[PDB]
Write a protein that binds this DNA or RNA. Structure first.
Ligand SMILES: [K+]
Ligand SMILES: [K+]
Ligand SMILES: [K+]
Ligand SMILES: [K+]
Ligand SMILES: [K+]
Ligand SMILES: [K+]
Ligand SMILES: [K+]
Ligand SMILES: [K+]
Ligand SMILES: [K+]
Ligand SMILES: [K+]
Ligand SMILES: [K+]
Ligand SMILES: [K+]
Ligand SMILES: [K+]
Ligand SMILES: [K+]
Ligand SMILES: [K+]
Ligand SMILES: [K+]
Ligand SMILES: [K+]
Ligand SMILES: [K+]
Ligand SMILES: [K+]
Ligand SMILES: [K+]
Ligand SMILES: [K+]
Ligand SMILES: [K+]
Ligand SMILES: [K+]
Ligand SMILES: [K+]
Ligand SMILES: [K+]
Ligand SMILES: [K+]
Ligand SMILES: [K+]
Ligand SMILES: [K+]
Ligand SMILES: [K+]
Ligand SMILES: [K+]
Ligand SMILES: [K+]
Ligand SMILES: [K+]
Ligand SMILES: [K+]
Ligand SMILES: [K+]
Ligand SMILES: [K+]
Ligand SMILES: [K+]
Ligand SMILES: [K+]
Ligand SMILES: [Mg+2]
Ligand SMILES: [Mg+2]
Ligand SMILES: [Mg+2]
Ligand SMILES: [Mg+2]
Ligand SMILES: [Mg+2]
Ligand SMILES: [Mg+2]
Ligand SMILES: [Mg+2]
Ligand SMILES: [Mg+2]
Ligand SMILES: [Mg+2]
Ligand SMILES: [Mg+2]
Ligand SMILES: [Mg+2]
Ligand SMILES: [Mg+2]
Ligand SMILES: [Mg+2]
Ligand SMILES: [Mg+2]
Ligand SMILES: [Mg+2]
Ligand SMILES: [Mg+2]
Ligand SMILES: [Mg+2]
Ligand SMILES: [Mg+2]
Ligand SMILES: [Mg+2]
Ligand SMILES: [Mg+2]
Ligand SMILES: [Mg+2]
Ligand SMILES: [Mg+2]
Ligand SMILES: [Mg+2]
Ligand SMILES: [Mg+2]
Ligand SMILES: [Mg+2]
Ligand SMILES: [Mg+2]
Ligand SMILES: [Mg+2]
Ligand SMILES: [Mg+2]
Ligand SMILES: [Mg+2]
Ligand SMILES: [Mg+2]
Ligand SMILES: [Mg+2]
Ligand SMILES: [Mg+2]
Ligand SMILES: [Mg+2]
Ligand SMILES: [Mg+2]
Ligand SMILES: [Mg+2]
Ligand SMILES: [Mg+2]
Ligand SMILES: [Mg+2]
Ligand SMILES: [Mg+2]
Ligand SMILES: [Mg+2]
Ligand SMILES: [Mg+2]
Ligand SMILES: [Mg+2]
Ligand SMILES: [Mg+2]
Ligand SMILES: [Mg+2]
Ligand SMILES: [Mg+2]
Ligand SMILES: [Mg+2]
Ligand SMILES: [Mg+2]
Ligand SMILES: [Mg+2]
Ligand SMILES: [Mg+2]
Ligand SMILES: [Mg+2]
Ligand SMILES: [Mg+2]
Ligand SMILES: [Mg+2]
Ligand SMILES: [Mg+2]
Ligand SMILES: [Mg+2]
Ligand SMILES: [Mg+2]
Ligand SMILES: [Mg+2]
Ligand SMILES: [Mg+2]
Ligand SMILES: [Mg+2]
Ligand SMILES: [Mg+2]
Ligand SMILES: [Mg+2]
Ligand SMILES: [Mg+2]
Ligand SMILES: [Mg+2]
Ligand SMILES: [Mg+2]
Ligand SMILES: [Mg+2]
Ligand code: NA
Ligand code: NA
Ligand code: NA
Ligand code: NA
Ligand code: NA
Ligand code: NA
Ligand code: NA
Ligand code: NA
Ligand code: NA
Ligand code: NA
Ligand code: NA
Ligand code: NA
Ligand code: NA
Ligand code: NA
Ligand code: NA
Lengths: 266, 121
RNA sequence: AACGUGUCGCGAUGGAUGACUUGGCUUCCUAUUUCGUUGAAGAACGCAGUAAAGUGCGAUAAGUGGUAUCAAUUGCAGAAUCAUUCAAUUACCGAAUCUUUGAACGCAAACGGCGCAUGGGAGAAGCUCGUGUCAUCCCCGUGCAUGCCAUAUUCUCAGUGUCGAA
RNA sequence: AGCUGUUCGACUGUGAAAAGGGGCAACAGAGAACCUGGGAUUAUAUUCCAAAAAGAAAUUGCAUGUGGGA
RNA sequence: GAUGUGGCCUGGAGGUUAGGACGAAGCUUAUGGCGUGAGCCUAAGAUGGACCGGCCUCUAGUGCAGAUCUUGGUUGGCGUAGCAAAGAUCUAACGGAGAUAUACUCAACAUGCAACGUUGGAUACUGGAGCGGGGAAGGAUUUCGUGCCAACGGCACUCGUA
RNA sequence: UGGAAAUGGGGUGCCCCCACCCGUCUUGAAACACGGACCAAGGAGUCAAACAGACGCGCAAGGGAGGAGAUAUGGUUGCCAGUACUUCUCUCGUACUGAAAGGGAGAUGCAAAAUGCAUCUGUGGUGUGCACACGUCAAAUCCGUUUGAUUUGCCCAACACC
RNA sequence: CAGACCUGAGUGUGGCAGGACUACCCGCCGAACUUAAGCAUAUUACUCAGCGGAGGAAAAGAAAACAACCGUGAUUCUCUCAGUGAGCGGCGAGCGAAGAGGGAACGAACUCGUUGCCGAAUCGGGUCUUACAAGGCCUUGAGUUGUGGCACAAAUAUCAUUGUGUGGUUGGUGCAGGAGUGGCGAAAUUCAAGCGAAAAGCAAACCCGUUGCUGAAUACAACCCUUCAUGUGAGUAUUGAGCCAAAGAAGGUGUUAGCCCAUUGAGCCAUAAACCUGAGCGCCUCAUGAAUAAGCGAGUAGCACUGUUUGGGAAUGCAGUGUCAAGUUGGCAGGUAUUUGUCUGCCAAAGUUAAAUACAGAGUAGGAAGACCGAUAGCGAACAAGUAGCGUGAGCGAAAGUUUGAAAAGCACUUUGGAAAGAGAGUGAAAUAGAACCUGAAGUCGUGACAAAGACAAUGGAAGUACCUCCAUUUCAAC
């Protein structure tokens, strides 16, 4: 609050042939008589100095938060949306990818590395590995020196079983009870590659509920109703029921020839 | 000696403002393959009268004996690693300890205790 | 012609920009986390083999002691040992040193000034038989401000205060 | 050489009389015992000079001896 | 003056996709191409020597020609105004790198100028209310010897309170 | 198939025509009005809170916290000051009026009680008013229709009278 | 006379105060600029400046409290109440709380005076017990002008006596464990390919691919032609083969590093006291639990005039001075003054008290950082910065990155010069990296080459043309 303002710095007036700006008092220094206190002056105060009452944090409606997580979960089950986001899923057996629960008993990272190779989730892990590099700006001077891509997300039913997966670079770990939208939609883009443990997959119907059955953990929460039942509007536009009420096609005028048409009617 | 942390500025301040005894550990060199098998220790801090071989840089492959561990210039001096000045006099060139590898250890009673407590078996 | 003008290549002056960052700013946390008359904070002088500033220290003065640690510090020089402790160097701390001042407090002060009590020190005059002792002079330690509280083997006193005995 | 009283110094239990705390403030006021010669310097000198002090003094404070009182 | 712009640009963040020691940012341009434009891109560097580009979203100390604007540097005027109170210096010798310093021709002048310190002479000034010998205040090593001539003594210095 | 032939761009000069100095107050500036030697870096609608309107989003007669707790996390250098979960509360609405004491809004039918009875699938009524539904005209048809108008019914949103 | 005790001196002995810090906190004192589009009440603001005083927090705090209920229950803080259909206000500008409700914290409670029953059982000081014991003995020393014990609503006795059992907070004595501190303490390639050009690529989701293929760099070095020279620092790069991971952690190292180094963890060792643990566990000592009525805080509370403060309005707190109670309609509060009489809550005028709360220009010892700044920015200060310098003084107060290089290898030696330096030569990948040396802009200047050019100040627009062009594109045979 006192930066740029820790001087006496009175203005000189008009009788002297200098601009009317506060000037540093005294003599015997190179700073004496120098312009002070202004955003234009060197060593002066910045325009509208920054304060700590700036609104750093936001309130989001609880239903809008749950709506967003549900939308990011639906998008993770569409292979074309996962591919569009950048993930390499050209060898994984199925989307959504669900594996057995035995991976929580792994003790060595070698076991976890072999499992990621078997379900063909190593292509997205390798993509993150090749993407490691130094950050491309001042952020590397800050504590943000390295950048990398995202890779697959492994969702476990509880806190256990992560010991063999913590050190694998390019693999994120999640909990079905607490699913983060910042990790389901990194960068704001839906379509994250998610690997589901089996017990986490069977918990999804009781955590987020159904269109008719309320969620067990989210009090009174049901999945939102669609604005469109079919959502395939092209199929409707090309349906025989629509086509049979469409206005008949008409023969159009012949395209003008390469010769200019008469204009002088006299 | 536990310099790396989440803050780069704090980590670089701890390294370049390290005391002399901290710089001894920071200026460590790997043992040879025969010394690793015998002592079950991957690396030891270099000291004077140790025999090393350069493994990185211009003098790569040059064997010699450590004649000084400066710790202020962050380098070690090897008797056989040297060059001539303009007037023809010979001066020692400082090599970073992590660029060399220890082939023979100078064993004292307290040095032998460091090897025993660092044994991995 | 010459001055001058323009364009280009190359030099000069000048230190922008970029990249770097042991610095700042801002937020959060952890504690057997708050100085001093047992003399603080601040101010002054000094200390290294070499040393202006700065740093650390105080006549034990770039430091003594003790614990760890384990072969340095380093511009040069010096250095018993090349090192279980008893002598590397770093880090930390229980033992110590800690000049002149400053609330500064024996009294003063543009004075490195002047004391009173009490212990010492040195004393080539004199006395004694170069030994002892030592007048004047000189040096050093401790105490000595003011106010308040408590206290006195129950210390010494004052009052045409109240008595009580003469 | 011993005792009594008697003069002067030191030592103590009785204590006449002395009203008015402690300091600072003058390098031109008060006060203050040394002044010549030097071949004694590169730079200080009424400050240095050593037995023939180049030397001549003046002043304090203590003592010893001689002399006169006590 | 309002508004719009899959309109341009800058520092950071979340994603994604790339480049770099066979050369990153930055910098230079008779260096061409594209865009109505803000601008983008390529080429070359006989530059540089290590980081950084595109796209979507987020964000802010986000765009300069001028405020007698702030700071730094430069700049015509300009080799210009000037460096004119206190009279004044001259000579030889020595010292000094500071000279008597020459393709050809040529005896020397007409091709090394101008300026220093010391000593001896000459001339002059201060003129005892002195550019004389002391001290206070103030200054605090300017005192002394030797060495020295980069910067300083607004010309000079071999001299100096440097 | 070359120090080449073209075309475009770039550079410099020259002709013939055009052509007042920028920023700024101002009715009027090329002004004998003010600020303007050059360049580099810096330099000015920001943050917070209350309210409103437009637009985006969620839910809806209900919406939403906040504070705080719980445990994934009684864990982790950090990521994680985030995310995930909860609230007999609180708040803004669903009702308004009066200075207050206090009161407190349906329709239809029958009837006229100083709280009248009955029923409840329902715009209080009227005029104008999207779509829709039966038709009806005029025009064009590739004879399937389509595009304008319009009668009636119901009129949604609105507007106006009761 | 003595002598006493009352008041007061002197000295000895043992102590304390003094100053610093002061961000937060407590007490007082206290503006104005500003807003009101003027200004005086008002606002700023019960704020700045000023004077005192503490602490790790302070202050407050156990109802003379809310309420008006089905009632709550010390204080402090948070959301909320509430920017308020409260209120205050030239009723203007503006200002402006409280109860309740959801929570944080909470083992939260005690002490004195008084009144009853006792009455020195009290306190200092000596000495002893391993002891300046909460202990024994002594002590006129202090205190009877009263200090100590017992009981007062969480209550219904205490005080003996023997047994019962409790205190690690009564004091001596001494034995454990832990926490906390300090030290120590983890994996895996310096693997293979060597240099201007393959230490490079291509087979166009995935696989084929553990495979096949292979060079438009016979490079480039400045008008172009020959001849002779010269030029690639260090692999954290590429490629191939592997390996570690309970460790991928983000720092260093000559380029971009999991495997070069430090690190990243279980664990191990060592401990003044204090802290935590059947209020840890023994011995001595010392303490200790269980089985009749009366009062309760007086120059105080009120009240009256002033003055200030508050939303507090016929007066919310407070201050001065005047006046001054009740306790047998007992007193205070119940937010419109008075006189009554009913109801409800509580019982002022002594005192202590932890947590939740602040740290709005503080410190000590450590940690986490950040959508922040990036050397005219960020603190004034990235650096011998509150420094150099300035002012009689109070005070004011900079500029400045030593980022040469990977390493000083910091240019030996020759030659000209008095020297500074120049010309060579060397080191280095690079001196156009040569010492406050990375890059090295703009502006301005010098030089070589060239374009020209009267005086129309110059610049500028549009159209051509002359000459140039290390620029781009196209074409080059029946095209
Ligand atoms: K100020
Ligand atoms: K600024
Ligand atoms: K919300
Ligand atoms: K990359
Ligand atoms: K990289
Ligand atoms: K990017
Ligand atoms: K320069
Ligand atoms: K820069
Ligand atoms: K010092
Ligand atoms: K003596
Ligand atoms: K008397
Ligand atoms: K004087
Ligand atoms: K003498
Ligand atoms: K994307
Ligand atoms: K690119
Ligand atoms: K500019
Ligand atoms: K301009
Ligand atoms: K300037
Ligand atoms: K002149
Ligand atoms: K000379
Ligand atoms: K005269
Ligand atoms: K004209
Ligand atoms: K106008
Ligand atoms: K005393
Ligand atoms: K005004
Ligand atoms: K209190
Ligand atoms: K409550
Ligand atoms: K005990
Ligand atoms: K213990
Ligand atoms: K290389
Ligand atoms: K590597
Ligand atoms: K690294
Ligand atoms: K009380
Ligand atoms: K108490
Ligand atoms: K603090
Ligand atoms: K620096
Ligand atoms: K470099
Ligand atoms: Mg600033
Ligand atoms: Mg950048
Ligand atoms: Mg912060
Ligand atoms: Mg304090
Ligand atoms: Mg010094
Ligand atoms: Mg001493
Ligand atoms: Mg020691
Ligand atoms: Mg040792
Ligand atoms: Mg004194
Ligand atoms: Mg004093
Ligand atoms: Mg005097
Ligand atoms: Mg007189
Ligand atoms: Mg005198
Ligand atoms: Mg005298
Ligand atoms: Mg003299
Ligand atoms: Mg761009
Ligand atoms: Mg920025
Ligand atoms: Mg140009
Ligand atoms: Mg700006
Ligand atoms: Mg100007
Ligand atoms: Mg002239
Ligand atoms: Mg003149
Ligand atoms: Mg003259
Ligand atoms: Mg000569
Ligand atoms: Mg001549
Ligand atoms: Mg004369
Ligand atoms: Mg005269
Ligand atoms: Mg004279
Ligand atoms: Mg004179
Ligand atoms: Mg002199
Ligand atoms: Mg001069
Ligand atoms: Mg005007
Ligand atoms: Mg006018
Ligand atoms: Mg104009
Ligand atoms: Mg005119
Ligand atoms: Mg004007
Ligand atoms: Mg309403
Ligand atoms: Mg006003
Ligand atoms: Mg006014
Ligand atoms: Mg006020
Ligand atoms: Mg104040
Ligand atoms: Mg606290
Ligand atoms: Mg307290
Ligand atoms: Mg309460
Ligand atoms: Mg409200
Ligand atoms: Mg107010
Ligand atoms: Mg009592
Ligand atoms: Mg290791
Ligand atoms: Mg590699
Ligand atoms: Mg290395
Ligand atoms: Mg490099
Ligand atoms: Mg117990
Ligand atoms: Mg009263
Ligand atoms: Mg007021
Ligand atoms: Mg009232
Ligand atoms: Mg009472
Ligand atoms: Mg963080
Ligand atoms: Mg700078
Ligand atoms: Mg700065
Ligand atoms: Mg500054
Ligand atoms: Mg100063
Ligand atoms: Mg002056
Ligand atoms: Mg340079
Ligand atoms: Na030029
Ligand atoms: Na810009
Ligand atoms: Na402008
Ligand atoms: Na000039
Ligand atoms: Na002369
Ligand atoms: Na032309
Ligand atoms: Na509600
Ligand atoms: Na004080
Ligand atoms: Na103001
Ligand atoms: Na509350
Ligand atoms: Na980790
Ligand atoms: Na009042
Ligand atoms: Na330039
Ligand atoms: Na002419
Ligand atoms: Na003209």
């Amino acid at each position: 609050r006192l930066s740029g303002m820790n001087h006496s710095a009175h203005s000189w007036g008009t009788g002297r042939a200098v601009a009317r700006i506060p000037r540093i008092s005294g003599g015997g220094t190179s700073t004496s008589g120098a312009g002070a206190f202004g955003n234009m002056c060197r060593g002066g105060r910045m325009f509208a100095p920054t304060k700590i009452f700036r609104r750093w944090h936001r309130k989001i409606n609880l239903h809008q938060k749950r709506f967003a997580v549900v939308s990011a979960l639906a998008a993770s089950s569409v292979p074309s949306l996962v591919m569009s986001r950048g993930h390499q899923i050209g060898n994984v057996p199925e989307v959504p990818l669900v594996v057995e629960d035995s991976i929580q008993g792994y003790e060595k990272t070698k076991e976890a590395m072999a499992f990621l190779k078997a379900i063909a989730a190593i292509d997205d892990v390798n993509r993150v590995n090749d993407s490691r590099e130094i950050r491309a700006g001042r952020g590397k001077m800050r504590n943000r020196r390295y950048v990398a891509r995202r890779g697959p997300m492994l969702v476990m039913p509880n806190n256990k079983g992560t010991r063999a997966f913590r050190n694998i670079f390019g693999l994120d770990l999640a909990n079905v009870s607490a699913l983060n939208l910042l990790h389901l939609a990194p960068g704001g883009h839906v379509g994250r590659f998610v690997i589901w443990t089996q017990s986490a997959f069977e918990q999804l119907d009781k955590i987020f509920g159904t269109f008719t059955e309320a969620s067990a953990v989210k009090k009174g929460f049901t999945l939102p109703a669609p604005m469109l039942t079919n959502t395939d509007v092209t199929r409707i536009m090309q349906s025989e029921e629509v086509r049979r009420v469409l206005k008949p096609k008409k023969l159009q005028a012949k395209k003008a020839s390469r010769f200019q048409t008469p204009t002088n009617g006299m | 000696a536990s310099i790396k942390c989440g803050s780069r500025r704090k980590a670089r301040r701890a390294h370049f403002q390290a005391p002399s005894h901290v710089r001894r550990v920071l200026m460590s060199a790997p043992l040879s393959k025969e010394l690793r098998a015998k002592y079950n220790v991957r690396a030891m801090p270099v000291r004077k009268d140790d025999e090393v071989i350069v493994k990185r840089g211009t003098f790569k492959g040059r064997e010699g004996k450590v004649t000084a561990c400066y710790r202020l210039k962050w380098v070690i001096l090897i008797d056989k690693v040297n060059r001539e000045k303009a007037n023809g006099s010979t001066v020692a060139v400082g090599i970073h300890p992590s660029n060399v590898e220890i082939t023979k250890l100078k064993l004292t009673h307290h040095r032998k205790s460091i090897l025993e407590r660092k044994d991995r078996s």
